[PDB]
């Protein structure tokens, strides 16, 4: 179960 | 930028017995960047029905992949894995040895 | 024993034309269970183990939306980092991400991790407390500041300590028949006459799961390192692993040497000694 969409660098 | 050459192991899934069906594996690991060309050879020619794993990588970020195909060893047929990568000036061929 | 769930993501820019190539894999322990590949036709998160096929279409819709969100974040990062590092738009670059959680025997949270790399080197990583970041250089330091102002650690922590563990447990229960079976290595020893005066003994460990194993040679009860070779642990292709270790010995002295094998699936380590 993936994490929510990550935050950009 | 930071290039790591592939380690190559060529081996069968199961102990090799002439005339019995088996899987030939070429395991390439420890390389970066990810683009790589891997062929399996029978007596010099590229085998067509070769499958590979999904790209993943290790603790030091280096990539690994498994290539494999179905085969039937015999006394005299040569099998091998040929690999090309930006870190190699020419493709490297690694012969299968039953005992390794 | 202990378990983990981990995801691996790779993106490779294609300056000549189009979007980056993106590949994602998930694992429970050493078992791959899902994949996504931007170049495959489905454009969906796909099962790679039978016990995940259980999951209904909302699972798969959800995972598919999330994984695409990951590929787009990486695509933006490839552009941002090329500018932070002052690189030309001509070359191909790579971003890599890995995160997940471990649980102990008791299936309670043990630890979580989230790490990110650019061109094969550490860029930024979550610290063990899951509240703060490790940046490797001044570009990553800029990313650290952005993620701190945006409270990224909190929300990761909520997932690593909560959601991740909860799903790991559900998968362990659903994939019980394999995921909670350990397969002890099948071992044997081979003998190769190198010359009239030396021989090689090779100790094999086959068809074992999980991948963690130790093979060590001893001579008259003490560890030996000189004149040995140890191959890296390698996948058999059916979900188990293989390894071997070899030692060169004077011919006629084979009985002095012993191979010791340790693995989670073995109550006692095994000892092998030549004379079948």
Residue numbers in the entry:
A (entry chain C): 1 to 9
B (entry chain B): 0 to 99
C (entry chain A): 1 to 276
Paste lines from the article.
unligated structures of A2-YLE, A2-YLE-3A, and A2-YLE-5A. the A2-YLE-3A structure compared with the A2-YLE structure. TCRs, suggesting that the Glu at p3 was a dominant contact for both TCRs. therefore potentially losing the dominant network of interactions. completely abolished TCR binding and T-cell recognition.
subsequently eluted from HLA-A*0201 molecules on melanoma cells. context of HLA-A*0201, present in 49% of Caucasian individuals. important tumor antigen, targeted by many clinical therapies.
